[PDB]
Symmetry: D2
Subunit: 415 residues, 4 copies
């Protein structure tokens, strides 16, 4: 009768590079990347934990975590230990050991056992902190204890051709995992439905004392690369009992989401498309749902302003999403998503543009098919999206034509 999230501690791994996001993560880790005009990427796993009733959260950080920690400090600050809530920000530092470096995602939880065990949670929900998805974790916990499993793994059931980019769980008729392959060219199919492969989300449920034992065992193994997926996961499927849990059984979908929503926005094209899709009439992710809300760090911000309307000038937004503190001054917006603080100035135009917080758009500047990094000041009259060769030289251009624009690229500019 007691919900099991009472006794659970969610541990978010937020050291992920997002190196495939190129300059988008040169000054911040992928979990700190803004998304959706809504939150940072990490806020989803944290919000999933919170709405699932997990009141103990630890966050392991590493790669350039100042922005990330600064965000966690100010957004996730409403846990009080007298209420058996806790939010531990757990960077790598010269604390319990010199290093200043986690040996791997397993070592991120190893070095901080002395923070976990004073809480003594019954279960530990290990989460990747770099995906955008909503999911009730109480379903995984119940399946975990009922099945007697040694580890329950969150899995996407996706068509097999797309599963070639994932780590894939080979599974029997009982959804017990019997093998794990990293990025198979021909992924094993689900028995009885071979067109789909089970695709690891990086979400692992254990019994805490079990994980602590398996985790110290890995800390002493020199064969181990100190990775959950590559070391902890294979040992248990081989010697213990690992059961896959399918994302669709615990996904939390609003009435306006036609299918379970999951995005890893690993590439520039993936990130741009996941954001620009929200300007659809019927987007795949409902950012206006209040049933499974996404908590984030937010400030009181003035509303958005649209100014000028004559023969030469008009500030307006069509097929677009516009956050607060955005002054659209004589600028024409179309199929674009703007975070807070954007200043778009007269005669400028934005199209297919994902504009991160506090960007300025100078007069006459015209930008199409772009991701504009936080705080970029676009010079007056700059054209992006007309000349592919000149665009590829000046900025990071994907093969599909999306230009990522950072301030370091703008500083380097002439003709």
């Amino acid at each position: 009768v007691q919900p099991l999230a009472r006794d659970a501690m969610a541990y978010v791994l937020a050291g992920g590079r997002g190196s495939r996001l190129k300059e988008l993560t040169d000054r911040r880790a992928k979990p700190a990347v803004y998304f959706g005009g809504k939150a940072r990427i990490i806020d989803f796993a944290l919000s999933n934990a919170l709405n699932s009733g997990i009141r103990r959260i630890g966050v392991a950080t590493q790669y350039k975590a100042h922005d990330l920690i600064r965000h966690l400090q100010r957004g996730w600050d409403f846990f009080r230990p007298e209420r058996n809530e806790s939010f531990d920000i757990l960077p790598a530092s010269q604390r319990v050991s010199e290093t200043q470096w986690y040996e791997g995602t397993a070592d991120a939880v190893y070095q901080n056992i002395d923070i976990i065990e004073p809480y003594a949670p019954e279960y530990m929900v290990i989460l990747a902190g770099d995906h955008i998805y909503k999911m009730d974790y109480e379903y995984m916990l119940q399946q975990h204890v009922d099945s007697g499993a040694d580890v329950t793994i969150g899995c996407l059931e996706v068509p097999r051709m797309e599963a070639t980019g994932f780590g894939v769980m080979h599974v029997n008729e009982k959804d017990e995992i019997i093998d794990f392959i990293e990025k198979p060219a021909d992924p094993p199919g689900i028995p009885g439905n071979e067109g789909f492969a089970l695709a690891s989300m990086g979400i692992y449920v254990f019994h805490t004392k079990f994980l602590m034992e398996a985790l110290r065992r890995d800390a002493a193994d020199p064969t181990s690369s100190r990775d959950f997926g590559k070391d902890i996961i294979p040992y248990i499927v081989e010697h213990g009992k690992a059961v896959a849990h399918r994302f669709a059984d615990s996904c939390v979908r609003s009435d306006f989401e036609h299918e379970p929503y999951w995005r890893d926005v690993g590439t520039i094209d993936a990130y741009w498309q996941a954001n620009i899709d929200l300007t659809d009439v019927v987007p795949d992710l409902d950012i206006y749902d209040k049933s499974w809300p996404i908590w984030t760090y937010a400030e009181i911000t003035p509303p958005a302003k649209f100014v000028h309307d004559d023969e030469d000038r008009r500030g307006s937004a069509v097929s677009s999403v516009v956050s607060g503190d955005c002054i659209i001054s004589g600028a024409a917006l179309n199929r674009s998503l703007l975070f807070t603080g954007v200043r778009a100035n007269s005669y400028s135009r934005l199209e297919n543009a994902v504009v991160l917080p506090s960007v300025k758009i100078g007069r006459h500047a015209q930008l199409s098919n772009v991701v504009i990094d936080h705080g970029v000041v676009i010079p007056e009259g700059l054209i992006v999206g007309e000349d592919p060769e000149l665009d590829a030289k000046r900025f990071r251009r994907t093969e599909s034509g999306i230009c990522l624009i950072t301030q370091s690229m703008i500083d380097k500019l002439d003709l």
Copy 2:
């Protein structure tokens, strides 16, 4: 050396009904009326207190105050007594007396002397809670002490004909008040510039001790209507020293405000105009200033959205102010201000509209020169502003052509 705001308590009087706002205050006191897509009216005086360094605030409520109290409870919740901060919400109820209703602005402070005295503030800053203005109260505090006055009164410098609607202080050359007149037919001019009169803002500065005795003297006097402006200040300008502080000395102007800003929006016209004026290219009030910020109760809200762009319908806003969680779906907005939560649907038109939170605009409606009440659902196909006689029979239509539209009115409608 020390700033005097350290030892000041701001006491906001927020019981005023605001009856000239008609049905706009039928469910809420005027200090709780939304304004500017920015805050409630009360928040300005409260934020002037905050920004002036006054960390002890009391608010007297009375007239329909649940909405008011709930906003105060959820927005102004960051004061801790261990830091010598307090925020007291003081409604008339069954506490120190039966009654359950203050008999005036002076009674509103007098009944709560047992709340003030334990704080023992050196100074009292009595504030009208129903006006929109920015002011650094520390200037008034310096002049009150340096002047040795018994009461210091904040006054607007106004052309005399406009002063006909105010309480007016007659002063000598040294800005010492010699007389007070309520709505003088011919207002006494300022010496040396007889083109202007001193119009009282409802802001008084006392020594707390001098104040306490004056209230006690007021509560024993049966000639007194228990009113600060009618009974407390007249007595002092007669038998003691009452000096006038000019708004322009203390007003906080951002670099984008061409003159000191003060509105009382006491009429549906004045309210609509002040809101609509924020849609100007260069507005008189700069709601994007951060140097003198307006705190209010804000929640995390999704951004604004504009959808549809075909030959027949296009969602967009021009010369407009739009708040978060507004979905503008195939609807046209022009010179309109929208608060949070508005749903405007296909082929509807807004012009010169002030739209309060959570209003739904049905398909094909066309509204012009309107103030729409909070949460109002506008039926599909409604027309306002085309037929003055039709509009006046259905809604509170002003002589100037503004229609105040409540859900009470909508519910009564056929043709």
Copy 3:
């Protein structure tokens, strides 16, 4: 799978005066009464809701509420609606009606249906706010929906001699209530265990829809006294399905509580006894347990201080519980519980004393078997507990010999 508390709203009735507590509730309703150097009495039901996972709480107020409301405002302030948390403080006032008074416990929920229904919780948990107990309401919820009952009523399993003063539920072998008796002289027996009676705690679980219906029907019935225990529930035990829930099945006990703990401290002696019992070596209530914590309003307070140790005076405490901000200066404490802020000065003696916050004990004062009200200043040399006739004339003395001491009594004393 999902815990039912997610879909519940706890509604706490905190209007009861507690008139048998006499002067102790002359200025504050019983739920606001301090208890245990721990919290106020209402802080047990609210924490049960919190710890049980109920995130929406309403508090119905009425009798002398200013202290209670100020406490809820400042202590219970960590709920944000974006997380679908809410804490509504709902006093009787000119809101949806003139009244300024609820007509009964049922009416207190009736007049606030417009607060409940926007939340649309699936279940209402109606709670008395004047008892000291720990309880996990998730148990009653799942019992409620699996039994199909129209009401699930929390009941104490007590010796029928003790149920003399309780509203008693008459049940069968299925724990379904046949009849309700208000204070039976000889109360009915549990079938199969007639020596124990089912005593109503005043804790009701409904389906929200059904409760709304019962309450509109009760609101239109003129036979009804608009009370839960006498109108809403007796109707259902007759026409619907009413099943009793027993305290021991859902009581939250720490490993240091030998029996399920519940106290209503309805009398001076009951209140003194429950407080003074926490000075025991093995107390009934474990106020040091952290597993089902009691949240309250608490301020950073300095530690307790004990000074003086010579032949004539020694500040010390024995068999006593001493809060922070207490300075025991040359004063002797024994078997006493002191709330925060007490100053006991030289040569004074406390024995068998419950001392509420901020009391001052003057020099040479000797007090035995006392309840000292909040803020009381005990004059130098006062002797209480030596002469019963003198004590009964000066203060409120129980037949068992406890004197409750208020400041209005002290102010009236010569010899």
Copy 4:
């Protein structure tokens, strides 16, 4: 007219290792050392900033900051940027440079120019975070600008032989600094009272623009050890204007403090001394002052409890300071100070003990002249303070008899 603290940013340096505190700072930096059952050492400079009206605070950490940062995260979490308040926690990390270790106190400001400049504070208040004192920084702010100084330096007025351990400022008749000596064997006396010397508090006030220049010149200089007291100030006294501000001009003393209070608790003896002095009848520091309060991280804690009172044992405290969540069970306390969470058990005796949080005192243990580290479990029957050579072998024993006791030493124990 406006207070200068509105335009100032406090920058606390809390990287100090406190090496002379020996094992007491093995696991924590000195600013995180508990003190006085009141707060951590860092909490005094932070509170002086807060109470002085400085709403922007930066804290530089370095040596083992995990406890420190976590304390700042959970304690100093009530600043909001939209109210022009900020609290930046700034450890040396991979952020703007590899390093992972500041080169000194000046470099700890220099490396975070990019944090301060967006705030554009007019003034910088550089504070040492490892001293216990109370001080109204607004006085320094006025002197600095009224003086036209390039840096104002807080100085203690100390008899000359005690200035032997300080950086000492040689001053002229109008308190302008003409020279600075690091630990002068014979400190330069103040002109006119040659019995006293101005000892540096490590408190500096600059104009922000001049400081950031001085930091950048310092960063380009290889002769500079990148430290404020050794490099920044010595440059200024030579080539610019440097003025002294005396601690007694601006120190905030409560009515019960006979002298300006400043302590550096730099040794085990000094640390034990300052804590144990708080058990005095009239202490030098009044921790019960509410006029200049010390904010800290505080949890809701149960009160203190004393139990047993027989022929053989009695739980009591004499001449002692006892925090909440302390259960004194059959233990005798004299002239001791206990932080929260102490558990002292039957037949144990403590005298002149400073007992840090969560310490367990086993039965029959007897300890005198003692500092017990956080969470230490003292084994039953341990005897300390009786045999110096034994104590000094098992423990870190001062020349004056104080033993600092860590769990690492208990773990190694036999006879």
